A paper describes a structure:
The Tyr254Ala and Tyr254Gly mutants exhibited enhanced reactivity toward cyclic imino acids by eliminating this spatial interference. Crystallographic analysis of the mutants revealed an enlarged active site, which facilitated reactions with five‐membered cyclic imino acids. These mutations disrupted the electron delocalization associated with l‐Tpr, thereby eliminating charge transfer and substrate inhibition.
Sarcosine oxidase from Bacillus sp. (SoxB) recognizes the cyclic imino acids l‐proline (l‐Pro), d‐proline (d‐Pro), and l‐thioproline (l‐Tpr) as minor substrates.
Numbering used by the authors: 2 to 382
Amino acid sequence: THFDVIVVGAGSMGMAAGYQLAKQGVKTLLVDAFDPPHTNGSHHGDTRIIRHAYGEGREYVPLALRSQELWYELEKETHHKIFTKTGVLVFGPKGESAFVAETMEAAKEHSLTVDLLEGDEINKRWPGITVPENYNAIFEPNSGVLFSENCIRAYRELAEARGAKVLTHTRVEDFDISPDSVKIETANGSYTADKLIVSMGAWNSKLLSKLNLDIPLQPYRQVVGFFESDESKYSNDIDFPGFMVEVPNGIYGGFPSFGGCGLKLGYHTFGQKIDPDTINREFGVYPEDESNLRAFLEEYMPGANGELKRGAVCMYTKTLDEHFIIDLHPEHSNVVIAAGFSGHGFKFSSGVGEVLSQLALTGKTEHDISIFSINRPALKE
Ligand SMILES: *Cc1cc2c(cc1C)nc1c(=O)[nH]c(=O)nc-1n2C[C@H](O)[C@H](O)[C@H](O)COP(=O)(O)OP(=O)(O)OC[C@H]1O[C@@H](n2cnc3c(N)ncnc32)[C@H](O)[C@@H]1O
Ligand SMILES: [Cl-]
């Protein structure tokens, strides 16, 4: 059967696209190597931060705000839990974090609601945080935490109810693009459509070559740990925030304990360079997995440094400039690419689903996606 649209990779981006297409009666096939949500890609480990005031760049702010509204819409549409409004705390040494400074500029440029705090004020407001007096902070009360696996699961169920088809456990191996149609090849059969969306996560770094693209995309092994914590300090129930922070040796992101699961932490600016088909997905096989996390906790969040309850191993896919790629294929207007989310895309996946649907159906989008151009110089070595 010939589809209107085929999505290859039904993960964060692809499943959101599938939902957007299905809701409009577009006949859509999604193909995934596994059965999303799953633990082999970039979307597991339960939780993801969404921030609006954006330390990676003030220009992501409208897409973040649109995505936030889309997440509230999803919360209303499903029985799965989507979002909890933890707020997000950003801190770092005063005058020595570009990330903090840009987050502050973004909030002023877009009139976001934030609180500015420094030093002992941070430690006083949130028992359990111990920063030096020379640190400053910006706290965003209305952003928070997404349950990422639930997001994908909900978009899947909703899309499928509207007639989208999802072909699981099926790896796309090659492509054949014509001026007026697209074709995918798999071990389970070949499929055709009018339009293609390519959203294969870390595997974009191996298979975009089949579409005659040569773009630096490096996959990285990124672990997270959940730690037994003082629940009187670090529980969501006592308003402990989500956080993304810069310290002299890099950026860390974390989450309050939800229902006693433990504070969750990840070291964002370091990971191992890997291949997605040979990555070691067992937490704790390198001593850095646990040690890098406790190095942060014992300094800054000392009551959240108990027994390791749970670990996970996830992948980032970085571009050279760490900005996304969201665009048409330069040689094929019937092919849409979503790649290179550089460890910070999940929060936008709802909005990206909308962009991808518009690009597929119309070749354009109402969103400003200029900074994510596939033709930009900074993508290339
Ligand atoms: C790993 C990670 C990422 C992350 C994060 C912490 C960790 C440890 N923290 C984040 C945060 O707090 N907030 C945020 O906004 N983002 C954060 N991230 C990044 C984010 O999770 C990623 O940027 C995002 O998930 C990327 O999504 P994308 O849709 O690109 O990737 P995916 O969900 O893995 O989906 C890809 C799918 O493609 C399928 N696949 C692969 N190969 C094939 C083939 N050949 N054929 C068909 N399907 C294929 C995969 O199976 C997967 O489902
Ligand atoms: Cl990523």
